[PDB]
Symmetry: D2
Subunit: 501 residues, 4 copies
């Protein structure tokens, strides 16, 4: 493919793609492994927010009753989220808070979800729930101050359209929960941004009904949130895996555009859309998350998602996760960008590569994005998504690039099936479920992207880049001006080194 | 050619090769860059000793006078060595102390050497020198304890046979020095291992005459020390470089062997030989040091060195160095295993690869060493030294390794003219003298060994490795037993992941 | 009163006191907070062993089924203990392993203990319990090597004599469990030191019977294990506290003495006694743990416990704990030496003070220990336990100490009701449950022990220390030799500095 | 003396006091010790700028020549200052650059200053000098960007009115150097802030003459810079100390006010004034620097200096220094707020305590500053300077603060002759010149300010605080509102803890 890149760009590539990221339940943020991962993530990708479950679930331990006199009185315990939210700010990432699930002692019923058993029943008392919300949100304000907390976003629950996350998928009782929550939030401070309905795909009439509910009853909404996944249901389970086929990335972008339109035609036309969960597969034990295909796939979404949505949050930044029990093996199919022992998966590198793009959009299509940075250098992320089985499937992309700076340093980073892929190498080691330190160390060496560099002189003010992508490669290409200093090394002559010319 | 690696080995590959390592002057150990460098070097190569000049030179500031009442009296400032040596022991490296150069205020003349102007004249008074030595040795014992200082070694002066390092290259006067120093040391504790004559090559009758001076006069010697290089004197200079031709590595090994023999024919037939400086070139501004050639070259030394010499200390661990002024550019020909910004140079990777070898020497010729680890894995370092100008020059090596382990994990790391070579990429950047942090980080990325993994079945309890070395490649190959766990993943099927088979 | 310290000591004060230390369950070692706390504890007190609950309980996640080829087969997930033990060894602590509690899937009934719901029923199948032990112990050996694991200890279950921890406190069923476990361990390696009965107090015929059981059936036992507390059952509960009266520490030492005597009467008279949990109170929400009284109390135990027992393991090193839910406030009555946010509690400082003592036991009574270090210096720890309510209550102590020195530097460190006491200060702050970072730093500053130094000249080779201990003071006194260097500062006169004399 | 602190104050206490700080020559910035110190300084006191010598002196290595052909051509080496200025920015501190001294290779003459021998002669060629500056400033802008460099300040030379620092203290020649420098700076970018004359006191007609010179010859000046000290010429020397009397703190403030007047009376009446060096003693071996008096003395300067000068830069932040050779002992009278081994001296605490103050000035006089912070809390630094010899000499300050809050947590911090004073304890240890690590740790533990806390109820809507300062005591007091949480601890009763009430 021959893509002629212009010197100038009308558009700006926005940073929506790294606005927010996902995470396993907040209680897992107490784990050193977790925070190692979060550190890595925030050093290499700069997420602004993080979005998880469990804030009000009982391992974090906020909501209790507590026998005083002979009445059960509510007790709010911030010991853990203080630590959690602190560890977050310390890593320059803010909570996209998600109020859920139901504390056990506030639950109206038994139903739970996940291995860690988040209670998914409504509050036995909405006054108690509201007071939870007021307490938490007020607690946050005390700890972090109002100006900090105002930058946070507060989602109400999670996937209420699903029977697993909300008793009977009750639209009406969710809307009651939304309204008590949204009102509770604004009552603490009116700038605080509360939103919903946190629905998973398959039920976008919920967004419309949610926005009709909010307009009709004058319920505050500051954003719509929605999840996006492209995996069909499991066509094969093992004791530790769900294998699922996938719709192409276009399916996710159409999901985004569709929900943007629902918002345009609603009484709240100006509302931000945050996709608070996205990946390929929605199961934390689907091995696709460990693969290069995941990288290549998710790159398209990084490219284009931001046209439709104010943010879209990769579920998750890390394999530290337990919705489906403790990981049974190093590469076990989890959502994480980072695997246990801080081994980036290929998808991590995809974010790393997008994080090198500039603001100025020179060219974008369905398999690349090409940007100018403020120093005049170019940054391109290209990907070769291939959802079909088979080998080779190399795609050459020819890039013609405007460069006035007579010489250029090109640095290219590739992750694919061979490179930046610890999953492949893990396989070769015997798929050790519980690898030794040495094996982890090799895995990490191997998980680094392949780097290639060159100096190229630009003939006619043009650089012609032949970029050969292999199956499911995501690659970062940067073209820097070379300010050559060779001429200051007077007499320099590598021909005077043994073996060199 | 075809190498049939025996299943078993009588001989043990010893750790002589990393007993000790070279350093820029001890004063420079105060530099944060220096410690960063030592720390990397101690994490990836665990050297036991570090040997450098400048212990008694005036930047470290031990020796002074000091008009106290009405008298110029000696003052021993240990502020800097306490901190230097402390920093050494904190990194699990002990000093191979070298008593030099002449404190300015103890100097008998003004001849200095180097940019930092180490004085190279005999002491104006040997009684004061003696006391310096007693004071230093004593102070060390007081700070670190007698048990610890006894593990240290003590060389006396540096290169006294060279006019640059010692006034008139006075053999007789350097023997006076050695005697005063050796006795000084021993008078403090008889078990302190003192030695000399730390000579450079070209005048090895100094070993003979030194050890007869020691026999005649019964001067304690506990080892012989000697430098060893293979570079002729510079035949080109720039304002910045020396370019030297190198003798091949056999010349260094014949140097080792011939000195060993000279010691065996001496009155002290059994003394240890510590080669206290070695590289290819002896100039810290010979770009050869930053190349792959350097690594391939030194790899043979690591392999055989221990045959003839109890230790051999690579000059140096780091480009933190000043003999020829402050590095005028990132890669500037410095002795260092590690370049500024902690960019491993190819020779670094050589040591690191030797660090992965086992005790059991299975096979060794002049281009490889093969070893069994105590868990039964093989570790083999192969190098392809090519001193002749020109491209290509690839060696095909065929390694036939035994192991009744069925399945095998091979990890291969290569560093050559393309991989693990930040010098070649520095040049592509336009030889930035003073690189941006971004350039540095690229350089670091690129300085990493290229890793290649595979799983192979064994046929007939044998692995057959067809190994292709590029020019001046050093490569580590490890063959580990795969204890394969895949069978525990019942239902595991990569064929159920999108794109995978 | 008056105490004349012998210049020489017959006996050695041993390190039994810091052989082992308690931890809240192993699952919590995943917390970054837990490890912060351990690093701290390992730098200031060097514990060799760490004994905790929950190795096999389900948060750590080892034991699962796992439906494979039509059966429920065991699935040993090592993800979490690998990470846990790793981190233990990285901080130079080994597991005093305690095989408990029942994995939910291995359990025969529903009885749990604690908020974390450790199952306390017999295995539904003792063969599978055997295979669990074999799996875990084997796994450890496969990861750490046999020479490492052989240094560990293995306690079977916890407090089988209590109904809360073991169905019916069934003695015969516990012996069955112990036999199965002890043989399973030994079946893996005969060096693996296994032991019980891990009983709480009140019921020491369990030792007698347990050992009778083992003699009769030739069941391997390598040590006896026992808990030791001195608190009566809670007389007052709030929703967050258990308040308890305490027996004096002689009571604990009598427990030690008495259980050792039951071992000498038994068929295994020479068996090690490891007291694997002691504290004052056995409630993790008794505020007593946070006080200076706890420190002063336990210092007597540190002083004398080793006379009777091979180890005694302070429950716990850290307030990272959850047996009674998540800490409801910074100081919440947790067992920890270390409070959250790495705030040392008074008791932490007691260990620290014992960590400064020498081998040579010069003098000891029930309020002090005095030791000679090998450099010749004295180290004394003194405590003024005062269990009575009220203020004042200051012990005077006249130490008369031989010193072979003449000029002496004394460093006293004190923690008591004023200093080294973040609890008192936390109360002044308004008892914030969830203190801000600022408050926490203040608490940490204030948690440090008060230091008083002084130079004293000996008279007639003796130092006469008049020491006043406030109520529940634990104080460390070190008397070190001064090698005065002031004479070398010729002309030094502080009287030539503004204001100084 | 009683002070009725008003609730609100019209004026702001400015942060001029910590705008900038002094340092040893930039070359020492390369030392690990130095950066430990800077780290600490920047974690506890937040300095915006750092100002020292040697930028162009040859240890930093920027100016060389460099025989190319037969010509000596200038060569600029940025290897060191890149690493220095990076290390600066990483620690959030910016260079208050100072162009000096003369590179040997550029020097017109042989006169040097200091042990390290900065050349203090005019350049041999002013074009060469100019080119140096352009080179240096262009480099900065290249590496860090114009926006960043525009925030830096550029002083020309140091103390040109002193014969030691400038050949013949030649005024007219300094103005030539100034003009050439300032013109060189402004030619690179006009917004770069260039300034001088960097004079030491006792010669202020130079500021007048300088500003007339610049006014008349239209030479750019953006700031006046000046040094301020109060020590008289030494009255005793030892081989290692200068001992000096000190004019009182008013003398310095009057120096500040006098120079502000000369500036107002000048052709540039609104120029900022930066005191680029102040301490009490101008010698780096005056033990007053090490003392508590230093602290209490510098406290009035921090309180008030800002009225008269835009900045005032305490020479120096650390003892890493060599103007008078390597430190001969731990506390050796160096300028540093931080002693070697990162042990803060009392003075460091004064900056720390001042760094606790709010912006809103409630009350100030010559012994205290009392401020309100944005959360309504009070912060006051009180000082009791006593320049006379003698014991005791305390000082009661009675602050009467309005608070209608019911209750108050008070946190006080004291460094005086007893507390926060490691010099005092170092003396008790026998003035170890080169202390053991154990000794250093005691020293550090002792270098911490004494902390006293209490809770105080309000009476009459007011708090009456009696603050006893002892000799040369600086003390920080913070009064915060207590939000008492005790009522939530329902049933709490410390009375139910052994020994407590
Ligand atoms: O160019 N020199 O000053 C020089 C020439 C030859 C030798 N040599 O034959 O050993 C030499 O000596 C040492 O090696 C290089 C230098 O960096 C070391 O400090 C010297 O000991 C130097
Ligand atoms: O210690 N000296 O050689 C010296 C004496 C007098 C002054 N002075 O009058 O200002 C002085 O100069 C400056 O201040 C102290 C020094 O450390 C700085 O480098 C100079 O700027 C030094």
């Amino acid at each position: 493919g021959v893509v002629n890149v212009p010197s100038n760009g009308r558009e700006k590539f926005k940073k929506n793609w790294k606005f927010c990221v996902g995470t396993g339940r907040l209680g897992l943020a107490l784990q050193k492994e977790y925070l190692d991962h979060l550190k890595l993530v925030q050093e290499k990708i700069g997420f602004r927010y993080i979005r998880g479950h469990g804030l009000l679930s009982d391992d974090v331990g906020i909501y209790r009753e507590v026998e005083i006199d002979g009445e059960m009185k509510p007790f709010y315990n911030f010991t853990y989220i203080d630590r959690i939210v602190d560890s977050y700010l310390a890593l320059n990432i803010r909570p996209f808070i998600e109020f859920g699930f139901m504390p056990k002692a506030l639950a109206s019923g038994d139903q739970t979800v996940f291995y860690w058993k988040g209670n998914v029943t409504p509050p036995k008392d909405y006054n108690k729930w509201r007071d939870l919300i007021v307490a938490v949100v007020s607690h946050f304000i005390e700890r972090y101050g109002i100006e900090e907390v105002r930058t946070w976003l507060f989602e109400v629950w999670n996937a209420p359209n699903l029977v697993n996350f909300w008793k009977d998928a009750n639209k009406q009782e969710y809307f009651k929960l939304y309204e008590v929550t949204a009102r509770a939030v604004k009552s603490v401070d009116p700038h605080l941004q509360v939103g919903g309905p946190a629905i998973c795909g398959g039920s976008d009439e919920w967004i419309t009904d949610f926005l009709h509910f909010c307009a009709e009853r004058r319920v505050p909404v500051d954003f719509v949130s929605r999840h996006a996944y492209t995996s069909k249901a499991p066509h094969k389970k093992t004791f530790e895996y769900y294998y699922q086929e996938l719709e192409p990335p276009e399916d996710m972008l159409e999901q985004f555009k569709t929900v943007r339109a629902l918002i345009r035609q609603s009484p709240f036309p100006h509302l931000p859309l945050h996709i608070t969960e996205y990946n390929t597969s929605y199961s934390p034990i689907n091995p696709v998350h460990d693969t290069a295909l995941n990288a290549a796939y998710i790159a398209r979404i990084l490219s284009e998602g931001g046209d439709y949505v104010d943010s879209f949050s990769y579920w998750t930044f890390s394999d530290v996760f337990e919705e489906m029990d403790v990981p049974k093996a190093l590469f076990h199919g989890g959502f994480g960008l980072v695997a246990l022992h801080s081994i980036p998966k290929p998808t991590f590198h995809a974010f790393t590569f997008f994080n090198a793009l500039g603001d100025e959009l020179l060219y974008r299509d369905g398999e690349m994005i090409v940007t100018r940075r403020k120093d005049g250098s170019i940054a391109a992320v290209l990907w070769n998504l291939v959802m079909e089985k088979g080998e080779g499937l190399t795609k050459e992309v020819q890039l013609v690039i405007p460069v006035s700076e007579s010489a250029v340093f090109i640095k290219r980073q590739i992750v694919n099936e061979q490179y930046g892929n610890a999953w492949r190498v893990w396989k070769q080691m015997g798929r050790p479920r519980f690898p030794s330190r040495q094996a982890v160390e090799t895995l990490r060496q191997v998980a680094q992207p392949h780097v290639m560099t060159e100096q190229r002189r630009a003939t006619d003010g043009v650089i012609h880049l032949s970029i050969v992508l292999s199956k499911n490669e995501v690659t970062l290409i940067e073209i820097e001006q070379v300010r050559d200093e060779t001429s200051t090394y007077v007499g320099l002559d590598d021909g005077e080194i043994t073996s060199y010319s």
